Nucleic acid binder design. Sequence first.
RNA 1: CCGGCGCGCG
DNA 2: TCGCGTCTCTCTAAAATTGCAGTCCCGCGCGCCGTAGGAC
DNA 3: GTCCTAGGACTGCAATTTTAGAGAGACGCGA
Lengths: 76, 585, 37
Amino acid sequence: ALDISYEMEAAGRFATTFHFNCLLSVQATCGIPEVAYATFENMEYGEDFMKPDTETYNWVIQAYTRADSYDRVQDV
Amino acid sequence: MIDRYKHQQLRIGLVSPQQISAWATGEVTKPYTFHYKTNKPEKDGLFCERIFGPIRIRRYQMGYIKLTCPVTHVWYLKRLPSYIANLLDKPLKELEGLVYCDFSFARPITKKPTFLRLRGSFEYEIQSWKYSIPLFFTTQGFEIFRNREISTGAGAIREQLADLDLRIIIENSLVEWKQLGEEDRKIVRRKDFLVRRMELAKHFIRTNIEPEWMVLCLLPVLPPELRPDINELYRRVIYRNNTLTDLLVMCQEKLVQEAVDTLLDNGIRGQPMRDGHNKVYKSFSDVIEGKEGRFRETLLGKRVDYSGRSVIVVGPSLSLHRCGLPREIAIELFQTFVIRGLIRQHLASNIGVAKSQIREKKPIVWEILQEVMQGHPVLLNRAPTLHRLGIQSFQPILVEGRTICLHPLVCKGFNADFDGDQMAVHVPLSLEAQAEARLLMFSHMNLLSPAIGDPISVPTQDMLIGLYVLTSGTRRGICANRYNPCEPFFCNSYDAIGAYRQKRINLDSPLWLRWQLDQRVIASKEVPIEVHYESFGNYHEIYAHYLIVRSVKKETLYIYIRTTVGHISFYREIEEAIQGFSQAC
Amino acid sequence: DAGYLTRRLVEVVQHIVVRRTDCGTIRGISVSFIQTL
RNA sequence: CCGGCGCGCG
DNA sequence: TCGCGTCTCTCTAAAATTGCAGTCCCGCGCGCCGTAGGAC
DNA sequence: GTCCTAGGACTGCAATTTTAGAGAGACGCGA
Ligand SMILES: [Mg+2]
């Protein structure tokens, strides 16, 4: 999915909130909140069509609350 | 745009004795370093070939020292505030006395039953505990249950840390903090200790760190190739540990602990222990910390290959993007490229023959050096690099002598003058580095200073005086004529400069120049001094610096500029520079 | 002293890099000299 | 191919 | 027959010094001197 | 000769060093 999204953006079609949410649906279960947070930071400080929605916030929150170690109450 | 995500991390952490063994697996048991006669690594010693590897792996293979008694880590006990003291919730004095003096701790462990009313840290030895209890309880069983009600040294500390219930610590600290709050200097400091204790206990729960690792059971041994002072401290640990196991007494237990503390961190116990020369030892903390330590000297700055140095001399004939390199520096820096150039055109059989040819200074070596230096930039750098313009990239050319030729207009950025200054030269090797140097660091794209945006390569001193004298106009008024007054006319600027060349006029002699462009002469916004109106229609308007002829019959308009050869020369120089650059592209 | 001052100055902001085109902020410092604007 | 001490240059 | 300031400590709340810890431009060149101590 | 041979200067900060605040158990004098 990441390779295809990179190729699609290379072809001239930029990723929107839909593709980013699709990517986040898998990153949120990796056990490392930093991957999902990097994707969220990419979305939040980007263009209008990449802006996060409720699903994006839910994915990042789920990634943070189900972390393997360290505390994440401040991040949430 | 999807960001090219890169998730790289590094984490420090307190190590476990099992991981120390995994590093070593390999235990150093003897304090011998090398054979006095055969100069061979002593077996089981600090340089043992079996433990560390054959005489690359000797730079990375670790060992360990099996301490008979556990020794506390100095960083976590003696550094202020003490982490062990805070986690155990006891004053530092009593812990230090337990570790350094002949003090025994009452009730060190809890998860096993006891039968005695011994609490606190009794400084004096218990008279009954010396004979009565051991003699009634014999020796084997008494020693079996000995280390459960009374203990001493770092072993008691490790036992206290191992059985600590962190969640109970957090709850007790929180409830005590609430009690203190619900009730003024150390009424707050006790609160601050409580807050510090729950935050310290919280971090242990979420990590894999164990608080008992703060007291060492094994001592990792640095690889030999990293210690070809530290070796002397390692012998002492073996010197006093091997003595201790021979006994198996309290004094030798303290001696081992002091050996480890000195090895780990000296200058922390007040008086730092010295060697036989009355010189303070250097510990691992000393070699990793400080301006001369590993972080600030070996990692933040490096010495590099393909670099040179020489004295700087001025070259006014150089271009703004060029520098002069000494022949020896150039042949040293570009040695591999000269070898490739020699081999490529079949003038060298192999690498050795090419190197021999270079060493003999053959006349054909310089042709290949000159060929390969074309298009390959270099980086110059003066010593006190105060801003980014302290290192710049130039196109090297071969100059005679032993000095580096530097452009005069780039000296201000380097803060360089030609009274003894020197510079370092670096050669970018890979294609990416060469592209970076050519497209980002050359002086012709770095004409502005990043601090505020002023130009940095502005003419200074001699050039400034030359321009000032050139553009200093005519002598005027009483400085031009002795008496109250009750000049050549040139068709074009070329005629005026030609007359100047033939010594017909001076540099500052006034002249009238026919102007065939728009009025573009900077002058005071003033009306004409005199208007000479003719009855035929033509009128002449005389200004301070030009004369304009107009007519009412026609639309003609003639302009004559009163100036000197210097102003014309400055204008022509800039105009010709622009036109030549435009034509050359 | 300046060398020590420069090291501390660079250290505190060494990690600041232009990484986004627009953070999306709406706040703005109010100004009422020319070289600043 | 390791560190100290002294003297210097920019 | 107790009651009263109170003798003699008594234990801790709250500043008041006070002894460490930390740090104190960059880059070059040259020379000298180590590596000691003691029963043979 | 020697061959193995074992003492600035400034800031920061927790740590004493009191100063103090109250204060009480047993009490010698006393109502
Ligand atoms: Mg100079």
